[PDB]
Each structure stands twice: as C-alpha cells, then as structure tokens.
Amino acid sequence: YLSKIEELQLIVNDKSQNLRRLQAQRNELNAKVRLL
Amino acid sequence: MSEKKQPVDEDNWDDDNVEDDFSNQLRAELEKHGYKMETS
Amino acid sequence: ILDKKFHGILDQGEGVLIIFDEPPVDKTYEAALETIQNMSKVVDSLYNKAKKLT
Amino acid sequence: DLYSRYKKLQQELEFLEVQEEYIKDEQKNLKKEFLHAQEEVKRIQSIPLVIGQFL
Amino acid sequence: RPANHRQLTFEEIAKSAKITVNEVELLVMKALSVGLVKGSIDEVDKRVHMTWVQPRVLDLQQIKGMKDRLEFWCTDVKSMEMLVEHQAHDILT
Amino acid sequence: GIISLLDEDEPQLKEFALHKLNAVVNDFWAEISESVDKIEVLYEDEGFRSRQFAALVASKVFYHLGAFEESLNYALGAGDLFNVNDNSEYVETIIAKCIDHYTKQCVENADLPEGEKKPIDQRLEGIVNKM
Amino acid sequence: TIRDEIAGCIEKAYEKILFTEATRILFFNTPKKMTDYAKKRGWVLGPNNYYSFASQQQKPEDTTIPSTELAKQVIEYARQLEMIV
Amino acid sequence: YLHYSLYDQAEKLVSKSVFPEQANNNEWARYLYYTGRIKAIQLEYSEARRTMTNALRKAPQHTAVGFKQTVHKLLIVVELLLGEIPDRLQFRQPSLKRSLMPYFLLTQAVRTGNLAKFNQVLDQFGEKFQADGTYTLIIRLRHNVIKTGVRMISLSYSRISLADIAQKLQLDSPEDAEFIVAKAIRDGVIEASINHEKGYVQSKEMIDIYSTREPQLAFHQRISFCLDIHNMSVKAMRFP
Amino acid sequence: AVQKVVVHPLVLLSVVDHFNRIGKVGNQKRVVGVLLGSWQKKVLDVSNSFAVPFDEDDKDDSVWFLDHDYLENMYGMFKKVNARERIVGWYHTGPKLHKNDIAINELMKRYCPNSVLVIIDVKPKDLGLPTEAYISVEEVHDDGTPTSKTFEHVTSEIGAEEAEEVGVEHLLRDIKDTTVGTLSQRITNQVHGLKGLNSKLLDIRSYLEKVATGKLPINHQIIYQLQDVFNLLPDVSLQEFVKAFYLKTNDQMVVVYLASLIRSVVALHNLINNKIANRDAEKKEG
Amino acid sequence: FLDTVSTFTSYELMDYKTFVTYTVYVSMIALERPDLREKVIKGAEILEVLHSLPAVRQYLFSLYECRYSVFFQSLAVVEQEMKKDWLFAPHYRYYVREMRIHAYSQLLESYRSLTLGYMAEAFGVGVEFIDQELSRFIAAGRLHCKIDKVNEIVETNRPDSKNWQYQETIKKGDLLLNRVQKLSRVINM
C-alpha cells in the first residue's frame, strides 16, 4: 500500500488549504480599505 | 479529561508572610528590647 | 541630610560630598504606569475570554 | 481506482501552494499602495489653512 | 610613535626635549598658547593625553606606512562591512 | 545492555546475542542507539556471518528512531533475509519508502542523454516486478 | 576524584595557603604527587608557601561584539517583520 | 513507567518526539507535569521549575476534593530543593490542611535554620513520607537547610568571618564552614575569600550591580519571549 | 566667492534637450552652452538656461567657437521676459574637463566676472550628484609660478523648489515613498561602504601613483593635512577604545530600554484584539 | 479617616479624642515624609485634639525628631498603647517593627559611612542588641543596607530610579500574560 497511503496523507493537506483560504481572506481584507 | 492518574492518588492567610517572622522569631520582643533600658 | 535633602549624599573620602542626579527618567515611569493599567485591561478582557467559549 | 486520486489532489496541492505564495506578496504590495494613499491624505494640509468655526 | 599611546609620560617629552621634568607643563601650556593642539593636560601621572595636532611633512617611507595603516583601515572596514552586509543580506526581499 | 557482551572473537556468542535481540527487542529500542558504531563494525566484517542480520535489526531500530533512509540502505544490504519477508506493516512502510527512492531515482535518471545514470540497485528494482 | 578536586579546589580559587595545609590534606608530606599537583596548577612554588595568584586577568568585558551581533539578531527580527505581511 | 521502574524515560532520550501542535490544555499540562516530575528524580532543576510552573497554572480545573493540590504537593518538593521557594500561603486548602500533603511545617522549617524540628518532621512524619515516596529529598534537603542558613546569613551580612558562622551554626571547626563556603562559591552563591593565615573568612561582595551590561542582554530573552508570543498570536490568527 | 549652489533639475533637462539636438548631427566633441543663474547670496541658484553652437578641432585646443551676438540677444530676451535671471556660467556634457576649458571660462568671465561651469553626464551610472562647480582663482603657488590659474572645486548639490516636482514624481511613478523600516538603510550600507571605500582605495591607488609616479604636484600641502583630519582616529590593532566600550553600552542603553518596554507593549497591542476577534470569527463563524 | 472634621459626635462614637488617637496611630505610617509633616505637623485642627494627650504629640515629635533613644522611649509608650486596642492587639507586632522599619529607612539612606557603634552610642544598647534586629530587618526582604564584620561600615543603596525599576514589567508579562498564553493555547483542542 505504497501510494494507497501517500495520497491519504496528502488528503490531510486539505487542512493546509484552510490556511490558504484564510490568506485569501487576508488579501480580501484591506482591499476594501484601499478601495475606500 | 480531568483525571488520568489523580483519582487513585481578611484572614491570617495573608498575614502568614510576616507571621513567618512572628512564629520562629520575636515573641518576647519588647520583653527584651523594652528591657534594653535597664539591662545595660 | 537625614530629615531634609538637597541630594547631599555623604562620602567620607571625596571632599565634594557629591551631589549628582538624573531627574528625567519618566520614560520608564509612564510606561510602568501604562502596564499597571494594561494588566487590568487584560484581566477585564479575561471575563469575555473565559465566558464566550464555554 | 487509486492512481486517479493523487493525480488530481497533488495538482490541487501544488496549484494551492502557487497561489499561497502569491497572495503573501499581494497583501505586501497593498500596504505600499496604502502608504501612497496615506501621503495623499497627508498632503491635504500643508501651505494653507482657512480658519472657520464649527456650527 | 604607534597610534597615540593615549597618555604620554614626562620622560618622553623631557627626553625628546632634553629638558627637566618641571618644564613640560609650561611646554604643553605654551603649545595651547600657540594653538596647534587642543590637548587635555594629563599630569596626574605626568603622562600627557593627546588631541589633534597640525601635521608635518609626510615622508616617502611615511607615504608607505600611511598606505600600510590606511589600507589596513580601508580593506578591514570594507571587508568587515561586507561581512555585516553578508549577515544583512538575507532579509532584503 | 546485553549488547556489550560481544568482545569475544568467536561469532557464536554474536548469533546467541541476536537470538536474544530478536527475542527481547520488544522492550529495549534505545540501547542500539549507542551501539550504532558496533552495528557498523559488525556490518563491515565480511566473513562474520551476522552482518546481514545486524543490517536487519539496524533497519528495525532506525525505523523506530527515524533513520528510515539508512534503514533503507540496510534493507538493501540485509541480504535475501530481507527480501524473504513481504507481509507486515513494517515491510509495507519500508517498501513504500523504497520505491519512493526508486521513483525519485527514475525521475532523476529519466532526463539524462543516453546514460551517465545513478546506479539503480538491483534489490529496489527487483521488488518492482515482485510487486 | 578527591585529588583532582584538590587540584581544582585548593588553589586557583583562593589567595594563598601555606605548606602545612597541603601537608595535611595532600598526604605523604612530600611526594612528587603533591609536587605534581602544585605544578599541575600551572604555578611555581616558593619556600613554605603556595600562593594562588596570577588569575582572572585584564578585567574582561567583550568590548562591542554583542552590540554588533545582537543587531545581527535584529536582522532576523526584521525577517520576523518580513514573514508576516 | 513511573511505578513500574525507570530508564524508560532514558529510553525516550534517543527518540524524544512530541506533538507538532500542542493538544488539549489539560492534556499538555499534565504531560508537562509528568516530564517535570521525571526531571525531579533526574535532579535537573532549571527546566523543571518553569515546566512545573507551566503545568501548575495550566490545569485550573479539578474536583473539589483536590487533585490540583495533589499536583502541587508532588510538584513543589524539588522547588523546596532549589535552595529557594516562595511561601505556600497561596495554595493552602482546608482538606489539604487535614491531609497535610506538602507539609506547611516543612517549608516553615525551610525558612528556619532549625534542625531538631526539621528532623522531627522527618522522623515523626515518615508515615506521610510513605505517601511522599520521594526520599531523595531529605539526604540533600538537610544540606539545603544548612545551605539555607549560610545563604540567609551571607546574604544578610556584607563581611562575616568563620568565627561567627562556623560556630554559630555549630560546624565545630572553621574548615567545615570553609568547605561549605567552598561549595557555595562552587555554586557561585557567595563571593567570599578565606584568609588562610590566621583563620579569617575575609568575605566580601562584588560590585557593579547597576544596569550597564546585564539587563540589555536579558532583554533578548525578554523580547524573544515577546516576538514568539507575536508569532503565537500570528498562528492563532491563522486558523479561522 | 561662491558658497554653494541650488540647482533645479529643469536646467539639467534643458541640457538634455540640446544633447538630443546634437546626437542627431555630426558630433565632434561635446556641448558648450550658456548657464544662466539667480545669484542672491554667496549661495547660487539657477532657474533656466539655453545653449549656443560650438565646434572644436584638436590641434592646439584654441579653435573653439561661440556666438556672443546670439548669446546676448537671447540673454536680452530672457532678461526682458524675466528680470530675475542673469548669466552665471556655462556647462559641458563630457564628464572629464580638458585644457581648453580655462580659455572658455576666462573668455566668458568678461560679461559677469564669474562663470561657473557645470559638468553633467547624459549617461550617468556611477557618479553621485551630476552638478559640479569650479571657480577660477589663484593660490598662486608655493613656487609662485607665472599665473597658475586654477579651477577650484566649489561644493554643489541638486537644488529644491516648491511644486517643481509636479511633473517629476507623477512621471517616474515607481517611487516607493517612505521605505523607513525596510532596506533603504542597507542600500546606503552597501553603497557607502563599497562606493566610499573604493573612493578610498582609488585614493590609495593615487598613492601608488605617488609611489611609481607623482612627482608632478606630489601635493604635500593639503593631502596629509586633511588626511590628518582623518587621522584623528589612527585605528590600529588592540583597537584603543577601552574608554569607549562603556560609551557604546550607553549608546545601546536607552534604545534597548525602549525596545524591551515598548515591544512588550507591542505584544500587548497585538494579543488583545487578536485573541478576541480571533475566537469571535472562530466560534461565531457558524 | 483623614477628614476628621465632620465626624463630630454621633451615638455610635466613643470618645472623639480617641478617634483622633486612632486616626493618628494609623496615619503616622502609610504617609511619606512630606505628607507626614503636612498632616501630622501642619494639621490645624488636629493640634488641639493631640494637645490633650502629651505623649501622643511627644510621640510624633520624637519620631519626626529622628533621634535614637527617644525612638525607643516613644516606642515604649506606643508599645503600652498598642495591645489595649480591640481588633488591633492581635496585630501588635508588625505595627511595632513597622514603626521601626520607617525609622531605620528614614535614618539609613542619608549616611553612607555608618558604623553601628554610632547607632549603639545613642539607641541605648545595640552592641549585639540591634545586631539580630537589623539582620532580620535586612534579610526579611526590606531595608536594604549591608551589615558588616568589625570593619563595620554600613552601606546603603539606590532610590529605585534606575535599577530595581527594571523588573516588574516582565514579572507581570510572565505571570498574567502567561495565563493568557494558556487561553491562547485554547484554540484547537
């Protein structure tokens, strides 16, 4: 079960993606500040 | 989540600080310092 | 020198009996006075903190 | 059915690392545009002033 | 002499001066009356402290020794400057 | 612990010692971390028979520690006593890491003009067609 | 481990001791053993005395090097201003 | 692996591995408490005081029968063994007063230079030392009593001699107090000197207690603390 | 006679356009044009200038041509339309001067008795400020030669004037205003260390010129004396600042006190709103 | 208590003069020397209601006089007085050494070439009598000076203008900010 488990531990990196969605929220923050 | 080994095994509560100087020491304080006048 | 003062500290071996001092050190004073109240503001936010979770 | 899975999600992960590196410098450059906006605010009062009173 | 010694004895001034101990004081005050040196008259030890002096003629061997201590300064400050900047190089972005 | 006993020149105490090692290996995994150099010396002795089983148990202990890559090289240099086992959780994690090494090896070697490649070892490419 | 701690704990930590204290604590009253220790301090004895001098020289200070290298720590402090936005 | 024996903590020491992220606050607290209580028998007193303080303040929720006074009881014994410890006038509980678990009398005798009552605590209260089970305290905690006495006196006085303290604390001789002061200077506690000619402790104190060089270097600990809490605030900001 | 200058970039662009006027034709050597000026104090100002045609063959550097009629005509023009200005000198675009320049200088020092030149560079990369000032006075010599008429390097700068940057900073558009807090200090570090100690190492290359050559004016008058102004610090090994480590600690003192106190208060700034709004967003997100 | 005017007589009072004695016993300390002299010395209406009892005014002027033996004469008077006082007499000790610590604090910052012979020549007897007294007072945490061997030079300290001030900031940014470090580590689990 080589890549049968590698892909699972890379499914864990969807929780890395919540940090990215947070960063996208950070860039969306101050976007309306500069547009104001 | 609270236990994990352990269920098997104003007052004078602030005066305790200088009371540590009152219990081991100075209980006959002015019974000697008050007698410094006439002892010598 | 005991009762009153002119910052006249005693030295038995100088001559001048040196009076020197630095009065403005309020840089640390006003910051300490801030931290005294800021710890109280943290304490008064701790109620919101410990109450809004559970 | 396994080999299709990390051929999608690995590509998803490296695309997301791509934009996760980009958005940092994005939010960086926004603060420089914000400082330009600050100077644009600050230069509204330099040479004149015409004193009134608030009614 | 090597750079200044920061404190220069009565034997030194009196030895180059071929004069007694009790005249180098008049000497350093007279140099202040001349105004070539702005010195502090260090004679608590009879050992005199140094400030700026109006220089004398740079010799050929003194051109070379000036190149020595000057390039010492130059490439040492430049090299340790590049070292400080080599530590300061990582945070430019 | 029971590993410093090997100052004898005869190897039968070493085989008795590994017979002890695989028996009570289930409680003493830190002691070989001081015996790493003894593992190296007993591995580099050719006519001494138990260099390969030393490589086996060294892969075991360095799989407990975290030196999975010298565990991998020891699994390569652990003889056919390594390849005789392919049914365990231990063995599936380390063949995952082994053909991980093989696939990074192949992706590196695949862009080379006609040769000059790194040596793809025969054990990690034989477990390919064994799988 | 007594004699090495004699060799670290009766000289080069004190001022001066006379020969009879070394005669009591360092037994056999003149071997090449207490002589070995007295020279093992890195020190030459006089008659009937063991000074413990010539130590802790120059009053060291480390002139301006922490001023440099802690600004080199302020460098990664600016990197901590960098890693966040 | 505490009651059933040890060196398993030394079996950790070549494969020590902790969490990536700290877990439940009670969990992380009691885990730090376990490893600090292991460093108690290891007699490493530097990391232990801060990790047991972290574990002490980090578990504020306990049943009213106790268990935080249990954790504190078996916590502060090596803190008594430090040579210095604050007064326990902030931890005294009435059921703890009836169960006499850390012995307020023990740290009362710590503040004294008393030997008869301290060894009376020992001999009289070996029944409660059963519940302690940490008998490594006493064989050097008597040493901590005599070090507490010499620390109190030498901290009080500027210059003192062996003629005062070497017989005031009845060490029967100058040289036994010379060995005590030798181990104190080996601990760096006192800055004394012994006149090895007439029988003087020609003790003294060092100088320059001003803020020239020391606090500005301690401010890298202070500000490293601050910036790491900045980054903890940043990682806290990173989750929603 | 000249204290310093206050020179606006507009006159430099007024050099640039005539450089464009000569880059399209047969360019023998360089540009020689008029430098007007607004001389008020011993300080100097220039608001504007214009050019004049010029050619120069190189056989005895004396064949060089202006048009004083055209010069005084357009001077009368710009003097009528602006009575503030007057001529103050000239300029040239080739960064290295030559021996004809004294003939240029003294031939135009007849209208006003001073005529300060301006070196510029149309392709500047390594220099600092383009603007340069000489003046033609005499010290006569130590050997007192027959009229050693020397250009004397007057200090210079780029000037400043209110609302003359309206075009400029709108045009260039790339300026990162107020980079205090990031990397401007290390740009100044790299450039002042390297680009000043290379000036120093080329001064010692000129010292090697005094070693292998340099009989010429070997100059034992100003060189070692201003180098003695340098030699206020003979910074030899053993470093000689036992009397300045405590002063350096005094330098460290107040700023590190500010750092400790204030950045503790900065952690105290961040944590409050960060925690509160953090768990607000976290457990009120759903 | 300091607003002693409006408390004239109500039918829960005892002797209003004894109210004056109680407020002066509690206001002689927790009152720094400018405030001390302004209240207990420049106090206008207080002077009569302490002109009744001589030993109270004698106590204040013996304390402000800053002698050595009238310290202890005065202190013996207030030793007699402090006991006879309900919900004060179980607190008879820290008030007495509090008077002492105020007295030694106002007497020991000013000198720096101080010998305890100069103390014991005028305190009464202190040749070994103030020895353990001042030693407990120093090593108790307060009253920073240095007690000496027969070299006998008592050496004093700083006014907390620079050095001792530099602690409480990190003493609170450890403790209370570490409590909120715990609450900060309440995010995930």
Sheet hosting strand I32-37, strand order edge to edge: I50-51, I32-37, I86-92
Q: With the CA atoms of H229, H219, H46 and H142 taken in that order, what torsion angle do they form, in degrees rounded to the nearest 10? A: -130
Query: Contact at 8 Å (CB) between H121 and H106?
Result: yes
DSSP H or E run through I90: strand I86-92
Interface of C with J in 17-36 (CB under 8 A): 22, 25, 28, 31-32, 35
Q: Cα(J161)–Cα(H211) distance, rounded to whole angstroms?
A: 11
Q: How far is G54 from chain E (nearest CA, A)?
A: 25
Interface of I with D in 171-190 (CB under 8 A): 176-178
Contact between chains at I204 and E67 (C-beta distance less than 8 A): yes
Q: Cα(D6)–Cα(C41) distance, rounded to whole angstroms?
A: 51
Smallest Cβ–Cβ distance between H220 and the set G16, G21, G73 belongs to G73
Query: Contact at 8 Å (CB) between H103 and H125?
Result: yes
> What subunits make at least 3 CB pairs under 8 angstroms with D?
A, G, I
Q: Chain G contact for H227, CB < 8 A?
A: yes
Query: Contact at 8 Å (CB) between B1 and H27?
Result: yes
Substitution target from J146, J168, J187, J188 for chain H, most H beta carbons within 10 A: J187
Q: Cα(I278)–Cα(I271) distance, rounded to whole angstroms?
A: 10
Q: Cα(H235)–Cα(A19) distance, rounded to whole angstroms?
A: 10
Q: Cα(D5)–Cα(C53) distance, rounded to whole angstroms?
A: 38
Q: Chain H contact for F29, CB < 8 A?
A: yes
Q: How far is I244 from chain J (nearest CA, A)?
A: 22
Q: What angle separates helix J92-108 from helix J69-81, to the nearest 10 degrees?
A: 160
Query: Contact at 8 Å (CB) between E92 and I183?
Result: yes
Contact between chains at H159 and J178 (C-beta distance less than 8 A): no
DSSP G58: S
Contact between chains at H30 and B4 (C-beta distance less than 8 A): yes
Cβ of H191: how many Cβ atoms within 10 Å?
13
Q: Classify the phi-psi angles of F85: left when phi > 0, otherwise alpha if psi is within -120 to 50, otherwise beta.
A: beta
Contact between chains at B39 and J136 (C-beta distance less than 8 A): no
* Rg, chain J, Cα only: 22
> Is residue F3 helix, strand or coil?
coil
CA atoms within 13 A on the CB side of I236: 13
> How big is the A-D interface in CB pairs under 8 Å?
48
Smallest Cβ–Cβ distance between G16 and the set H196, H213, H231 belongs to H196
Q: How far is CA I242 from CA G59, G61, G63, I193, I248, in A?
A: 11, 9, 7, 25, 10
DSSP H or E run through G65: helix G65-83
DSSP-H helix ranges across chain I = 9-23, 68-81, 101-108, 168-172, 184-212, 223-230, 245-283
Which has the closest alpha carbon to I132: I120, I122, I142? I120
Which has the closest alpha carbon to F104: F124, F76, F75? F124
**Structure resolution in Å?**
4.2
Contact between chains at F92 and A6 (C-beta distance less than 8 A): no
* Residue J177 with chain I: CB contacts under 8 Å: 267-268, 271
Strand partners, I36: I87
User: According to the entry, how was the structure determined?
Assistant: cryo-EM
Query: Contact at 8 Å (CB) between G47 and G18?
Result: no
- In three-state form (DSSP H/G/I as H, E/B as E, the rest C), the secondary structure along chain J is CCCCCCCCCCCCCCCHHHHHHHHHHHHCCCCCHHHHHHHHHCCCCHHHHCCCCHHHHHHHHHHHHCCCHHHHHHHHHHHHHCCCCCCCHHHHHHHHHHHHHHHHHHHHCCCCCECHHHHHHHHCCCCCCCHHHHHHHHHCCCCCCEECCCCCCEECCCCCCCCCCCCHHHHHHHHHHHHHHHHHCCCCC
> What subunits make at least 3 CB pairs under 8 angstroms with C?
I, J
Nearest CA in chain H to F66: H15
CA atoms within 13 A on the CB side of I275: 27
Cβ of H188: how many Cβ atoms within 10 Å?
7
Q: How far is E87 from chain G (nearest CA, A)?
A: 7
* Residue H211 with chain I: CB contacts under 8 Å: 253
Which has the closest alpha carbon to J20: J64, J61, J53? J53
Q: How far is J89 from chain I (nearest CA, A)?
A: 45
Q: Cα(I88)–Cα(I50) distance, rounded to whole angstroms?
A: 12
Q: Chain G contact for I152, CB < 8 A?
A: no
Q: What are phi and psi of I92, to 5 degrees?
A: -145, 155
Q: Cα(H201)–Cα(H205) distance, rounded to whole angstroms?
A: 13
Q: How far is D44 from chain A (nearest CA, A)?
A: 17
Nearest CA in chain G to D23: G85
* Residue J149 with chain H: CB contacts under 8 Å: 157-161, 164, 203
Q: Cα(G43)–Cα(G47) distance, rounded to whole angstroms?
A: 13
Return the structure tokens found at E29: 């005050």
> Residue J137 carries which side chain, given as an amino acid letter?
F
Q: How far is CA H184 from CA D50, G53, H80, H177, in A?
A: 76, 21, 17, 10
Q: Cα(J160)–Cα(C36) distance, rounded to whole angstroms?
A: 17
Q: How far is CA F34 from CA D4, F63, F70, H11, H80, in A?
A: 45, 15, 16, 11, 35
Return the structure tokens found at E23: 């005249």
Strand I32-37 and strand I86-92: the pairing is antiparallel
Q: How far is CA F93 from CA C48, F83, F98, H18, in A?
A: 48, 14, 9, 21
- Give the long-range contacts of residues H136-145, CB within 8 A, separation 24 or more: H136/H41, H136/H43, H137/H77, H137/H78, H137/H80, H137/H81, H140/H81, H141/H80, H141/H81, H142/H115, H142/H118, H144/H80, H144/H81, H144/H83, H144/H110, H145/H109, H145/H110, H145/H113, H145/H114, H145/H115, H145/H118
Cβ of I126: how many Cβ atoms within 10 Å?
8
The per-residue DSSP string of chain C comes to: --SS-SS----TTSSS---------HHHHHHHHHHHHHHHHHHHHHHHHHHHH-
